[PDB]
Amino acid sequence: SMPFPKDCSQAMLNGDTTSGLYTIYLNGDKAQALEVFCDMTSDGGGWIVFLRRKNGRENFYQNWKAYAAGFGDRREEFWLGLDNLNKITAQGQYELRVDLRDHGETAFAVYDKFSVGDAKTRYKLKVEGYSGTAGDSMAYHNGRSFSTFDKNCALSYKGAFWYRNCHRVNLMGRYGDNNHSQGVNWFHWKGHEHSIQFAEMKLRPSNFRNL
Numbered sequence: 001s002m003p004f005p006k007d008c009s010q011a012m013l014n015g016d017t018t019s020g021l022y023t024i025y026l027n028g029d030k031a032q033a034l035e036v037f038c039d040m041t042s043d044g045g046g047w048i049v050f051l052r053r054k055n056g057r058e059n060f061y062q063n064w065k066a067y068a069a070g071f072g073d074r075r076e077e078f079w080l081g082l083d084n085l086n087k088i089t090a091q092g093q094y095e096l097r098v099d100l101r102d103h104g105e106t107a108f109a110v111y112d113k114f115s116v117g118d119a120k121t122r123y124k125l126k127v128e129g130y131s132g133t134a135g136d137s138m139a140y141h142n143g144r145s146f147s148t149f150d151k152n153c154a155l156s157y158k159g160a161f162w163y164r165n166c167h168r169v170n171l172m173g174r175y176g177d178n179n180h181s182q183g184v185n186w187f188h189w190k191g192h193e194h195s196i197q198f199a200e201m202k203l204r205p206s207n208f209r210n211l
């Protein structure tokens, strides 16, 4: 096992093959301990889950400080936080996976290259290298800074994202809200008038597929 695993891939290969809560260490630094939910089953596992939507019990209409730091319940609905995502994606080349499920249908999207800038970039999104079945809805968002109501689409649509003008993805939107662009949307799968029941965003090293 690796004493201070810096993501859910290093934490898995230690043998641990159950999805659940695990401790990771940013830059492998024992002083930068982070609790994450590892999805160890989806496409060979080793994923840090950074968003989960599944029942609308948690409020995602939260401020910049809340999106930077993280919020909610890692076992249920949560946001891991942008400072975390910046530090994780700085450790090497990460891939993004999005898993969607709504009234029994499933779709996914993988981006070979995924990173989040530091606070000085307003946590700039980078997503390149699409494959999957949900449709390339993040390409629209590539290069966008993060937006919350207090730093305008977040206020217009009552959510938070790497907004442009405004979104094809709104996975931190209002739960079960089918009003145009207000819900948990992945436009190129279910459009802007269908709020998705279940959504996870997760990352692991892009080189995991053949490590």
Ligand SMILES: Fc1ccc(CNC[C@H]2CCCO2)cc1
Residues within 6 Å of the ligand: 069, 070, 071, 072, 073, 074, 078, 079, 080, 081
């Ligand atoms: F994924 C996440 C990441 C962060 C959080 C909020 N952390 C709260 C701090 C202060 C009191 C306890 O920890 C929730 C879910």
